[PDB]
Amino acid sequence: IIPIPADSYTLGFIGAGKMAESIAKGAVRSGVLSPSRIKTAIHSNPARRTAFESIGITVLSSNDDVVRDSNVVVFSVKPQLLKDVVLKLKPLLTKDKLLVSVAAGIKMKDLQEWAGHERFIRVMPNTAATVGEAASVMSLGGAATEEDANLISQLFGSIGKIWKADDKYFDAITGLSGSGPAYIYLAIEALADGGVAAGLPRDLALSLASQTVLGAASMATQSGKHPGQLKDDVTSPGGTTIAGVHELEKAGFRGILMNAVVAAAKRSQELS
Amino acid sequence: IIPIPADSYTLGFIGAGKMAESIAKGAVRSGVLSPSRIKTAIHSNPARRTAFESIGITVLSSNDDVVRDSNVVVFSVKPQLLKDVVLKLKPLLTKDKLLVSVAAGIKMKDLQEWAGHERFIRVMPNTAATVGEAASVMSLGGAATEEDANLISQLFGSIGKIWKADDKYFDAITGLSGSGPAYIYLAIEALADGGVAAGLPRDLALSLASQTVLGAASMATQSGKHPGQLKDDVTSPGGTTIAGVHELEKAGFRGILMNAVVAAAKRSQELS
Amino acid sequence: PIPADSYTLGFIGAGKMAESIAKGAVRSGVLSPSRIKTASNPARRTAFESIGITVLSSNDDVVRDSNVVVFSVKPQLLKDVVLKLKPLLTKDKLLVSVAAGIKMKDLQEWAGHERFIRVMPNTAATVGEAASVMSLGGAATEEDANLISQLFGSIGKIWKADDKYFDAITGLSGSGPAYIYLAIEALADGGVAAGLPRDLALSLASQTVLGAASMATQSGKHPGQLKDDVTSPGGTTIAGVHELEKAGFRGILMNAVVAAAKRSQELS
Amino acid sequence: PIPADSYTLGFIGAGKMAESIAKGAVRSGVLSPSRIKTASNPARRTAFESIGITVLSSNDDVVRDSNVVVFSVKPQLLKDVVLKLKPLLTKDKLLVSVAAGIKMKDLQEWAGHERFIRVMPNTAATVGEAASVMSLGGAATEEDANLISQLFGSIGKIWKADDKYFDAITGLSGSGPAYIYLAIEALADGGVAAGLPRDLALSLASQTVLGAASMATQSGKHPGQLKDDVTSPGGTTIAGVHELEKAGFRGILMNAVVAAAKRSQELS
Ligand code: PRO
Ligand code: PRO
Ligand code: PRO
Ligand code: PRO
């Protein structure tokens, strides 16, 4: 358990999907890494190979060599495949390498057993990694150090925001930050549909819906205010806003979003 | 109707509230122009005076003089006060001066009648101007030129996004981009409450809710995809996301947000 | 490997579905009636003979003379029919089941080999607009799959899917037509409620549904984008869409598919 | 009589609908491009020229050279366009409006005669599956009606109805497609909710809806009878139907048609 060189470490991606690509592009764009310090492996796909080569990253032909040449290894293969991929690589997963999983649903306990050591970090990002606005959370294996954690905070700080949480919260986090985008995509469509129902042109309605939601969320993220206080700031007496809010409350809007989160968290638990 | 000098115009703020401050700071930050080209008038308030002076803007003691010395005049007084303010200034509101109103609910027809001419532009921003992510729309008076329009698009561009729309759409716009932030503030709180209901710590739940909403909206604003396609991208077969979406649909979630927009638009129309 | 242009096809079970597949294959020229065989009912006999197909008197002989065998007997009877024919079901013969609810695992065990394809069509086979899905046994080849794609392309559209999805498919493409029959009737009733004559209302409802689905199948657009294209500002379409959304219309159709899939699973 | 086999057709308004009609009429051989003429975008010129149709530079000349004239300009513009052309709108020329919301009474007053037919198509014209209805001006002949049935039979189906029904028709065939687009999406979402892949779920949802509607349009059966045909005892289909009925599904689609019809009436 030698510390990972903060400025000079090499990063290996096992699994070359969208999420790996988003992390690699983000890390390069923000200067956390240069492409020469990143490796990935691809077998079947010439298209995925292009995506990585086109940003200056060397694509090797085996997972084995990616691991050998990497200080930090990020596993992003489909969850059902991960176990076998880890077991295959096990002899090369020496304790001087920091391992990271972004696989949905795979608990720390299992990651550590498969790898045979506890220098492992688990990250659950979400779909907004693509535009650098992910909501990510990380949990630490029993041998992951504070310096390991900071290294991974910096890496994933390049695709959005990142927080720390106990592994036991990850089902619930899945129902909120993992699944929540889709609740907001519905909301944006419905707002647009509402604008059209009130007489707006479709393109304007949709533009305004998206940006209105973006704006409100930015107010929430930056203002340091409770959401109740933000709602109080825009609800003028007997005005348009409070009329709309009242309809939401009549229908139990808040409860409906609570139910979604809860059901999704419950499904996450059931999928084990 | 001489064109406004694009590089050398002077700007006057009648009404020195948060919205005027935001536009002024933004314009200066982004280099659209220097504080020396900007004037505002304040009577009662030494605190509002500080806010403007502290960014290098000269505060005069009368509205009359602000207008005299300005090519472009932005009215941001409370809507109920606007009519009387305009009527008082009317002799000074000559056709060579481009007028702009950010007042909620005041129609172009009325602006033009009060001012006695048609070189008037109406801008309806929303509350996210504070963090530079406003959803704004502009309508043009009968004598406002394309160049006038561009001058305003550029002036305002510091506070968010701006779209052009007929004045007749503005009641409805109020129900969507004006009032919509409060719908999202409810949504953020409800998502947080949902996370806590599923076992998450409050601070994490709130941080995730806000950033999950921000991320989704960013995906919608940048991706070029229909919201339905974005939802389809994140709904894995039999997964957590679709379970949550299903609860939203069972409850008529989209129809509720439509009802809010429509009721708010209806209230806007009733408030005249 | 089955001869692509000269194979013979045998139908075990001579019901509506087998008739539809036979007629479709002939109409479209995939097959000539002389290349088709099938095996109490004089009326069913007529249906096959009337399109030029030879009706034999035993299942055994249909199998002997066929490269490809399609089983369309009632599901509860299939096991015994297959076990009876087993000695004749040699590996050079591609077997196909259209039986509702019978898993690939079971088909393969009954036959004693894995050169088996499962197809689940739906009721619209009758008018050549079936929504069908196929799963492949462990020894079914790509060429076997293409042969069956071509055969069932003659009665509608066909897609590939893992056998494990077949319960859920049943709740969507199997059961979905009924959801649409209710919708057509309710649309007609709606037209009448708004003052239209009944015959017109019904004609419009059916052809409106047909037209919309054709737009969906051919446009390459997401349904949401299609809905956006027709929803004029403050117009008639959006007013109607708003009533749907107030009532949770989407959710109700999701519930139907989910409950039907759950029932399919329970029926094993 | 308009010459049934040799008439020339003129499009005043060169939007999507006019393009769909022109392409349909050509594809099906009702017309050759040389027998069609049209007269706001240099891009729209390409769309018509690219299928062999001559674009003229004035509405006046389109009319002069046409036996049959189809008005597809935006409804608010139609009155002024007709009034401008009035001296050229002689009684030997059959006039047609596809403009939403414009009553026969008004069309006839603007044109100064009653040899006018009104057609309300819907969005599925683009794929040749429109649901259209026509009403006849006081001087439109049976032969005029047949000519227009044939023309619009090239973009889907067409029925006759009194002008007074056109608000309600709008709520049903005009607005209905969107109801179906929501249905298709919801059925796909339902499939995914039951475990299906998205692409398969969507493909199946669209084709299932297309198939069902084809059964309705071709079978000659009442929708209730078609629902009875697919609802097996205690099976998957009836479990899904039951969920629909628990929620009042039929009523919701009735509400949509009614509210849309009401809005059409309000938009005058
Ligand atoms: O609550 C209201 O009426 C004002 C107007 C839109 C934004 N807030
Ligand atoms: O739907 C699912 O299961 C995955 C996990 C969260 C986002 N998509
Ligand atoms: O939404 C509307 O008003 C138009 C007319 C029917 C189809 N779309
Ligand atoms: O209702 C049932 O169970 C069968 C299966 C789908 C079509 N009808």
Side-chain angles (χ1 to χ4, degrees):
Chain A
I1 296 171
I2 296 96
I4 307 300
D7 299 315
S8 69
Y9 73 93
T10 52
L11 176 66
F13 288 101
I14 302 298
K18 301 264 181 178
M19 184 53 62
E21 178 180 1
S22 287
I23 298 160
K25 282 177 77 186
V28 170
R29 160 179 63 72
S30 76
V32 175
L33 274 159
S34 73
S36 61
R37 286 166 62 191
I38 304 176
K39 300 288 166 283
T40 188
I42 297 161
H43 328 67
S44 147
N45 200 265
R48 286 323 281 163
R49 178 187 282 276
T50 303
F52 280 85
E53 290 186 332
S54 84
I55 52 181
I57 292 169
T58 302
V59 179
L60 311 173
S61 51
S62 81
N63 284 356
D64 289 9
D65 288 338
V66 174
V67 174
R68 290 182 214 286
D69 305 342
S70 299
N71 302 111
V72 177
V73 182
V74 176
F75 296 95
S76 69
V77 298
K78 265 161 165 284
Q80 330 82 48
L81 309 178
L82 181 53
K83 180 175 178 170
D84 291 326
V85 165
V86 173
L87 290 172
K88 243 206 160 77
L89 290 160
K90 188 170 167 170
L92 305 166
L93 304 177
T94 50
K95 295 147 208 286
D96 61 326
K97 295 174 198 294
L98 175 56
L99 306 186
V100 181
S101 174
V102 303
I106 310 305
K107 296 165 194 316
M108 184 52 77
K109 177 188 204 293
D110 292 337
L111 297 169
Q112 291 180 153
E113 282 178 26
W114 304 342
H117 65 79
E118 305 199 340
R119 206 189 186 169
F120 223 127
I121 290 174
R122 181 189 173 185
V123 184
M124 172 69 192
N126 75 0
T127 187
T130 300
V131 298
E133 292 291 354
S136 298
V137 306
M138 79 161 78
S139 61
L140 306 191
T145 65
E146 276 320 294
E147 291 70 44
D148 291 340
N150 294 325
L151 188 152
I152 300 309
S153 298
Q154 176 192 65
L155 187 59
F156 281 79
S158 96
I159 60 166
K161 296 283 178 273
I162 183 140
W163 291 273
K164 297 185 195 191
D166 272 38
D167 213 61
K168 74 178 158 172
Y169 297 126
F170 275 58
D171 285 332
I173 289 163
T174 300
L176 177 51
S177 51
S179 300
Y183 316 158
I184 305 302
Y185 299 151
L186 263 65
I188 285 168
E189 187 174 14
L191 289 164
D193 280 336
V196 173
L200 303 182
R202 172 59 66 181
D203 293 340
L204 181 66
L206 185 57
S207 304
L208 289 177
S210 296
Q211 179 65 29
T212 297
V213 176
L214 171 47
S218 306
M219 291 288 284
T221 57
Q222 299 181 44
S223 68
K225 286 169 172 192
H226 193 277
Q229 188 52 65
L230 290 171
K231 167 216 86 197
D232 289 356
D233 294 346
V234 298
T235 43
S236 318
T240 67
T241 308
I242 193 70
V245 167
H246 195 185
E247 291 298 308
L248 299 178
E249 299 284 17
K250 292 176 186 290
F253 177 76
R254 293 160 182 266
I256 287 168
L257 278 164
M258 293 181 70
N259 294 340
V261 174
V262 170
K266 176 179 175 198
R267 182 58 169 156
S268 172
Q269 187 284 316
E270 288 172 6
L271 290 169
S272 129
Chain B
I1 297 170
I2 296 97
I4 304 297
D7 340 288
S8 70
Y9 75 91
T10 54
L11 177 63
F13 288 99
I14 300 298
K18 300 264 182 178
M19 187 55 63
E21 180 180 3
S22 284
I23 298 162
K25 280 177 77 185
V28 169
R29 159 178 64 72
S30 76
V32 176
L33 43 28
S34 19
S36 61
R37 286 165 64 194
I38 303 177
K39 303 286 166 284
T40 188
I42 300 178
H43 327 68
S44 146
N45 224 141
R48 298 308 302 148
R49 181 186 281 275
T50 304
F52 280 84
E53 290 186 332
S54 83
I55 53 182
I57 292 168
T58 300
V59 179
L60 310 173
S61 50
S62 83
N63 285 350
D64 285 15
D65 288 338
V66 174
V67 173
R68 289 182 214 287
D69 304 341
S70 300
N71 302 112
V72 178
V73 183
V74 176
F75 296 94
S76 69
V77 299
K78 267 160 165 284
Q80 331 80 49
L81 309 177
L82 184 52
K83 180 175 177 171
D84 291 326
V85 165
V86 172
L87 292 173
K88 245 206 160 76
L89 290 160
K90 186 171 168 169
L92 305 166
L93 305 177
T94 51
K95 298 147 207 286
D96 59 326
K97 293 174 198 292
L98 172 56
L99 305 185
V100 180
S101 172
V102 303
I106 311 305
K107 295 165 193 315
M108 182 52 79
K109 178 188 204 293
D110 290 340
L111 297 168
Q112 289 181 156
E113 282 177 25
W114 302 339
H117 65 80
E118 306 200 339
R119 206 187 186 170
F120 223 128
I121 289 173
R122 179 189 174 190
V123 182
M124 173 111 193
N126 74 359
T127 188
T130 300
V131 298
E133 293 291 355
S136 293
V137 307
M138 81 161 75
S139 58
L140 306 192
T145 64
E146 277 319 294
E147 289 71 43
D148 289 342
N150 292 328
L151 187 155
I152 302 308
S153 293
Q154 173 196 65
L155 179 56
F156 270 70
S158 93
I159 69 164
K161 297 282 179 274
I162 184 139
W163 294 271
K164 292 187 195 190
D166 275 36
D167 210 66
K168 75 178 157 172
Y169 298 127
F170 275 57
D171 287 329
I173 288 164
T174 298
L176 174 53
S177 52
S179 301
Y183 316 155
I184 301 305
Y185 298 152
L186 264 64
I188 286 168
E189 189 175 10
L191 288 163
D193 281 338
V196 173
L200 303 181
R202 174 60 65 177
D203 292 341
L204 181 63
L206 186 57
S207 300
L208 292 177
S210 296
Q211 178 67 29
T212 297
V213 178
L214 171 47
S218 303
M219 292 287 283
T221 59
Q222 300 181 42
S223 67
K225 287 170 170 193
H226 192 278
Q229 186 55 65
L230 289 171
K231 166 218 84 196
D232 289 356
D233 294 347
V234 297
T235 41
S236 319
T240 68
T241 308
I242 194 72
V245 167
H246 195 185
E247 292 297 312
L248 299 179
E249 299 285 16
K250 292 176 186 291
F253 175 78
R254 293 161 181 264
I256 292 168
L257 282 162
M258 293 182 68
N259 290 342
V261 172
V262 167
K266 176 178 177 198
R267 184 58 168 154
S268 173
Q269 186 283 318
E270 289 173 6
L271 288 169
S272 127
Chain C
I2 308 298
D5 179 50
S6 70
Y7 74 93
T8 53
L9 178 64
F11 287 100
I12 303 297
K16 300 264 182 178
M17 186 53 64
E19 180 180 1
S20 286
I21 295 161
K23 282 177 77 186
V26 170
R27 159 178 63 71
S28 75
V30 176
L31 273 158
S32 74
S34 62
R35 287 166 63 194
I36 303 175
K37 300 287 167 284
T38 188
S40 129
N41 195 267
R44 287 241 79 54
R45 254 204 126 88
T46 305
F48 280 85
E49 290 186 334
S50 84
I51 53 181
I53 292 168
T54 301
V55 179
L56 310 173
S57 53
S58 83
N59 286 348
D60 286 12
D61 288 339
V62 173
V63 173
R64 289 182 214 285
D65 304 342
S66 299
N67 303 111
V68 178
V69 184
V70 177
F71 297 93
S72 70
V73 299
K74 266 160 165 285
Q76 330 81 48
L77 309 177
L78 183 53
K79 180 175 178 170
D80 291 325
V81 167
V82 173
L83 292 172
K84 244 206 161 77
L85 291 159
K86 188 170 167 170
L88 305 166
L89 305 176
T90 52
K91 297 147 208 286
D92 60 326
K93 294 175 198 293
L94 173 55
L95 305 184
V96 181
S97 174
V98 303
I102 311 304
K103 295 165 193 315
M104 185 51 78
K105 178 188 204 294
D106 291 338
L107 297 169
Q108 292 180 154
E109 282 179 25
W110 304 341
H113 65 81
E114 306 199 339
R115 207 189 186 169
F116 223 128
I117 289 173
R118 179 189 176 187
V119 183
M120 196 190 335
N122 75 1
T123 192
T126 300
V127 298
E129 293 292 354
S132 294
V133 304
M134 80 161 76
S135 59
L136 308 191
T141 66
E142 276 320 293
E143 290 70 44
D144 291 341
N146 294 327
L147 188 153
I148 300 310
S149 297
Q150 174 193 64
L151 186 61
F152 283 79
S154 96
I155 61 166
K157 298 281 179 275
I158 182 141
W159 292 270
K160 295 185 195 191
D162 276 35
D163 210 61
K164 75 177 157 173
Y165 297 127
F166 275 58
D167 286 333
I169 291 163
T170 298
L172 175 53
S173 52
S175 300
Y179 316 153
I180 302 306
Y181 300 149
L182 263 62
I184 288 168
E185 188 172 14
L187 289 164
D189 283 336
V192 175
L196 304 182
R198 173 60 64 179
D199 292 341
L200 181 64
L202 183 57
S203 300
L204 292 174
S206 297
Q207 178 64 34
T208 299
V209 179
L210 170 49
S214 303
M215 292 287 283
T217 58
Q218 298 180 44
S219 67
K221 286 168 171 194
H222 194 279
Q225 187 51 66
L226 289 172
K227 165 216 85 197
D228 289 355
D229 294 347
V230 297
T231 40
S232 316
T236 68
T237 308
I238 196 69
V241 166
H242 192 182
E243 292 296 313
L244 303 178
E245 297 282 22
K246 290 179 186 290
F249 177 75
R250 294 162 182 272
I252 290 169
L253 281 163
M254 293 179 74
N255 291 344
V257 173
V258 171
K262 174 177 177 198
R263 182 59 166 151
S264 174
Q265 188 282 319
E266 288 172 5
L267 288 168
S268 130
Chain D
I2 304 298
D5 301 315
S6 69
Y7 73 91
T8 52
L9 176 64
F11 288 101
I12 302 298
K16 300 264 182 178
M17 184 53 63
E19 179 180 4
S20 287
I21 295 161
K23 283 176 76 186
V26 170
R27 158 179 63 71
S28 74
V30 175
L31 275 158
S32 72
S34 63
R35 287 165 62 194
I36 304 175
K37 300 287 167 283
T38 188
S40 92
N41 331 45
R44 300 268 28 168
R45 179 187 281 278
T46 305
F48 280 85
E49 290 186 333
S50 84
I51 53 181
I53 291 168
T54 302
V55 179
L56 311 174
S57 52
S58 82
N59 285 351
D60 287 11
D61 287 340
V62 173
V63 174
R64 289 181 214 285
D65 303 343
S66 299
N67 302 111
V68 178
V69 183
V70 177
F71 296 93
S72 68
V73 298
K74 265 160 165 285
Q76 330 82 46
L77 309 177
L78 182 54
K79 180 175 178 169
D80 292 324
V81 167
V82 173
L83 292 172
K84 244 205 160 77
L85 289 159
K86 188 170 167 170
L88 305 166
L89 303 177
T90 51
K91 296 147 207 286
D92 61 326
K93 294 174 198 293
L94 171 56
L95 306 184
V96 182
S97 174
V98 303
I102 310 304
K103 294 165 196 315
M104 184 52 77
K105 178 188 204 293
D106 291 338
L107 296 168
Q108 291 180 153
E109 281 179 25
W110 304 341
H113 64 82
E114 304 199 340
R115 206 190 185 166
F116 222 127
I117 290 173
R118 178 187 176 188
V119 183
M120 168 69 192
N122 74 359
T123 192
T126 298
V127 298
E129 291 292 353
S132 296
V133 306
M134 79 162 77
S135 62
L136 304 193
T141 64
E142 275 320 292
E143 291 70 42
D144 291 343
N146 294 328
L147 188 153
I148 300 309
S149 300
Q150 176 192 64
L151 185 60
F152 283 79
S154 97
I155 61 166
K157 298 281 178 274
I158 183 140
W159 291 272
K160 296 185 195 190
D162 275 35
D163 211 60
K164 74 179 157 172
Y165 295 125
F166 275 55
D167 288 332
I169 290 164
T170 300
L172 175 51
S173 53
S175 300
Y179 317 159
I180 303 304
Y181 300 149
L182 262 63
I184 285 169
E185 187 172 12
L187 287 165
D189 281 335
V192 174
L196 301 181
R198 174 59 67 182
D199 292 343
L200 181 63
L202 184 57
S203 302
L204 294 174
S206 299
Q207 181 65 30
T208 297
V209 179
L210 171 48
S214 304
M215 293 287 284
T217 57
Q218 299 180 46
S219 68
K221 284 169 171 193
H222 194 279
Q225 188 54 64
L226 289 171
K227 167 217 85 197
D228 289 357
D229 294 348
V230 298
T231 43
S232 316
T236 67
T237 308
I238 193 69
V241 165
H242 191 181
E243 292 295 315
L244 299 178
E245 296 283 16
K246 290 178 185 290
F249 178 76
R250 294 158 182 272
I252 287 166
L253 279 165
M254 293 180 71
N255 293 341
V257 173
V258 172
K262 176 178 176 199
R263 181 59 168 154
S264 171
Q265 186 284 317
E266 289 172 7
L267 290 169
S268 129

